[PDB]
Design an enzyme around this catalytic site. Sequence first.
Site, PDB file in Angstrom:
ATOM      1  N   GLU B  15     -22.915  13.612   3.761  1.00 28.08           N
ATOM      2  CA  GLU B  15     -23.922  14.308   2.963  1.00 28.08           C
ATOM      3  C   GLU B  15     -23.762  14.039   1.441  1.00 28.08           C
ATOM      4  O   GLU B  15     -24.690  14.313   0.656  1.00 28.08           O
ATOM      5  CB  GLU B  15     -23.884  15.819   3.267  1.00 28.08           C
ATOM      6  N   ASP B 200     -28.967  21.140  17.118  1.00 29.58           N
ATOM      7  CA  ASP B 200     -29.232  21.195  18.582  1.00 29.58           C
ATOM      8  C   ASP B 200     -29.520  22.630  18.928  1.00 29.58           C
ATOM      9  O   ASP B 200     -28.983  23.515  18.246  1.00 29.58           O
ATOM     10  CB  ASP B 200     -28.105  20.625  19.463  1.00 29.58           C
TER      11      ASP B 200
END
Lengths: 233, 225
Positions: B15, B200
């Site tokens: 990131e 998810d």
Amino acid sequence: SHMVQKIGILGAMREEITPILELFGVDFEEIPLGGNVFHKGVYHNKEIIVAYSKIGKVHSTLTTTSMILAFGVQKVLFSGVAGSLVKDLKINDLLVAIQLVQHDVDLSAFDHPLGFIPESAIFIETSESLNALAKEVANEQHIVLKEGVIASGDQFVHSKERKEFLVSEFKASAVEMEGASVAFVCQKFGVPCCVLRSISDNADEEANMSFDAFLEKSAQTSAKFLKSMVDEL
Amino acid sequence: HMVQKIGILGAMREEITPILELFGVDFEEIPLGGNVFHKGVYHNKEIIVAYSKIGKVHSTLTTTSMILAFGVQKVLFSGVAGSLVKDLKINDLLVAIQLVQHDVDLSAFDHPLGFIPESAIFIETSESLNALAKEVANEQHIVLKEGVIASGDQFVHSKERKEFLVSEFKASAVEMEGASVAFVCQKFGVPCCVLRSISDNSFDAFLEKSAQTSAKFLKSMVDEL
Ligand SMILES: Nc1ncnc2[nH]cnc12
């Protein structure tokens, strides 16, 4: 001043540091930071910075970091109580942790060994030099001092099944909730660390009852021994 | 007077570059405690960016260091989390209204799970940064979801453990670092905002996508600070 030696002395609970402040016997200045109260005194020309972190890994990582970064401590001595995982370690007995593990870390879903975190290691080491000093002081006081692995995690262990896991997975001799995080932070900064514990319970179904009956005496035992080490520093 | 100093943490190494590159200014690398801190000046604010590393001890260390060594006054923490609830989907962006350390257990003393004496089960975050996040989300056409994030040093995937996090803490999503960074910020009086992209309900591809959109989100929060 950098010409003044600075030593951090940590416990997790108030009861583990109360005896330390009493034994050192000098005046301490109270300095609040990050939710902790640091007690700063000068003893034999050394600045000693004393605090209890509050229980568990996040609290003890935070406090050890503050001692090193904010107070400039260049050794950390940790004193407190732990549960025994081995029959030869009985209530009030002293152990110095030669290696520590975070026993509750579980990234095995991604094939890491239990206790392992990327960029780190299962076992964290403490200062050969300070542990060698603990051994010398124990010998010179006729106290029996065991050396072993201490397992740390964010649960108070009180079950035969968890004890058996700690012995089989890590060969640990004792369990507590802070040692590995304090030793880890010291390793990241290159600061000598010693982790001393006195046994308060057997980490089994009765451990809460033992812990409460024995906490204060065990905390006193560890606290006296730590003071003996600072006297030889 | 004093310059504003903002700390930006990413929970995954992937990131970090997207953040530095989007800010577009020069960053200096400063190593400390085994962590690397990237320091630049953007719109006359000092921005300190770091990967948190994995698990609560690493992320407590990184955050405490950023506060004590760099003097950050506010902290934004971006990352990814798995959903525990029916109304979240892949790529949703969630702001943590509260967080909990889900693995803390002093039940041997009849304390509730997640509780430590001299502490509390739930950790709060900054009302004003969470509100700013909601404003930025509006502007970027993103619906910002709100929820409780649970953090612990185990990967949580079993049915029994996911249902425990919902029943015990009413958590909406789970990860390993958020709670500890919010907790450190609370101890020091530092406003914190924790944002997670839901992973998810291909990981590397999801990671690459979410890092860019989170970089874009973080920069526009900084633009408003
Ligand atoms: N049984 C136990 N588990 C964790 N920490 C402790 N400290 C003292 N006894 C303990």
